[PDB]
Amino acid sequence: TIKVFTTVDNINLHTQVVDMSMTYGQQFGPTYLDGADVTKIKPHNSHEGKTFYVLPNDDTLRVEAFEYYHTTDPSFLGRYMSALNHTKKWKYPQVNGLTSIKWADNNSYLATALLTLQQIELKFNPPALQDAYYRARAGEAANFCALILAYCNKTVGELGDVRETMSYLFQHANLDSCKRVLNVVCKTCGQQQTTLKGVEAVMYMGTLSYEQFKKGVQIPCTCGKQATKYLVQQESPFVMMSAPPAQYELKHGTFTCASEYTGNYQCGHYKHITSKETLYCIDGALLTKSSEYKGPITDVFYKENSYTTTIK
Ligand SMILES: Cn1c(=O)c2c(ncn2C)n(C)c1=O
Ligand SMILES: [Zn+2]
Numbered sequence: 001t002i003k004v005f006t007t008v009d010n011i012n013l014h015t016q017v018v019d020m021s022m023t024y025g026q027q028f029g030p031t032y033l034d035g036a037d038v039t040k041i042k043p044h045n046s047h048e049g050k051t052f053y054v055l056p057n058d059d060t061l062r063v064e065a066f067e068y069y070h071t072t073d074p075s076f077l078g079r080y081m082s083a084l085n086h087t088k089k090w091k092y093p094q095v096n097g098l099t100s101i102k103w104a105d106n107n108s109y110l111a112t113a114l115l116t117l118q119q120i121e122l123k124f125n126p127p128a129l130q131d132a133y134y135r136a137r138a139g140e141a142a143n144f145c146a147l148i149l150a151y152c153n154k155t156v157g158e159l160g161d162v163r164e165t166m167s168y169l170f171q172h173a174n175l176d177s178c179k180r181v182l183n184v185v186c187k188t189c190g191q192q193q194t195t196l197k198g199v200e201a202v203m204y205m206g207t208l209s210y211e212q213f214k215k216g217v218q219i220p221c222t223c224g225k226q227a228t229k230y231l232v233q234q235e236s237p238f239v240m241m242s243a244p245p246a247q248y249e250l251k252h253g254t255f256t257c258a259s260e261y262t263g264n265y266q267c268g269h270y271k272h273i274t275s276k277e278t279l280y281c282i283d284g285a286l287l288t289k290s291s292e293y294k295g296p297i298t299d300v301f302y303k304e305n306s307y308t309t310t311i312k
Pocket of ligand 2: 186188189224
């Protein structure tokens with residue numbers, strides 16, 4: 001017999017005596033050793049003392065799992081392991097001071113999401129995610145990428161959407177106190193103010209221009225006229241403005257960073273544009289600098305703190 005540790009978080013370890021005549025799966029359920037699936041394997045003597053991950057299959061492990069990952073989805077950990085086997089083999093070059101990802105397995109959407117996160121102010125609430133995120137910021141991003149895939153219910157190689165991805169991640173970020181107040185004005189129906197909080201206060205779908213959002217965008221009214229919607233008040237460290245991809249000119253110094261999307265739902269590619277002393281296009285491991293940029297932009301990120309309209 002051998003003594004080992006089992007765990008769901010590699011924080012709380014639990015002693016186990018292992019029967020060498022049974023596989024790990026027969027004793028523990030699906031079981032991983034340093035990420036390798038050992039479910040169908042007989043214990044080796046050399047495994048004595050090692051730490052194994054298992055699926056949360058009792059109350060203690062379930063609570064520990066929830067406390068570390070902030071999800072009760074029982075398939076989460078298996079999904080994470082499957083992703084991590086791949087993301088450990090990706091490469092994470094430093095590009096223009098940021099951790100990027102060299103292209104692999106259609107991962108451009110994860111690269112531009114990671115590049116974006118390093119330019120906006122945000123903290124993740126699940127300890128697993130915030131821990132992985134700080135390692136990713138330093139260049140060791142495999143765990144962070146596998147968690148993102150797991151949180152988004154995506155597998156390695158699946159095409160992804162940055163906006164959807166950002167939405168899921170923001171739901172695990174402390175945006176609780178972010179606030180947006182909007183006003184919609186119809187000459188017939190009058191004015192209707194709305195207040196949004198959390199993730200809905202920092203994401204908008206329909207226009208890339210933050211300035212246009214402040215000035216007012218035309219939206220239809222059920223009465224049949226065109227109403228105007230504009231931003232009354234914003235309280236957040238950034239905003240995300242998105243729209244269906246379309247040719248768009250990005251101007252140095254008017255935005256923080258942006259996502260460009262080429263292709264369709266069957267085959268496509270993201271690039272990342274950032275505004276520094278000039279414009280930089282980060283494309284996985286590739287870097288290109290230019291003073292102007294035009295492309296099929298789909299998300300633009302802007303810094304914010306507090307904004308109040310002067311529209312009376
Ligand atoms: C996979 N892939 C694409 O699919 C792609 C692209 N540029 C345009 N497209 C569509 N690049 C650079 C790419 O690596
Ligand atoms: Zn109306």
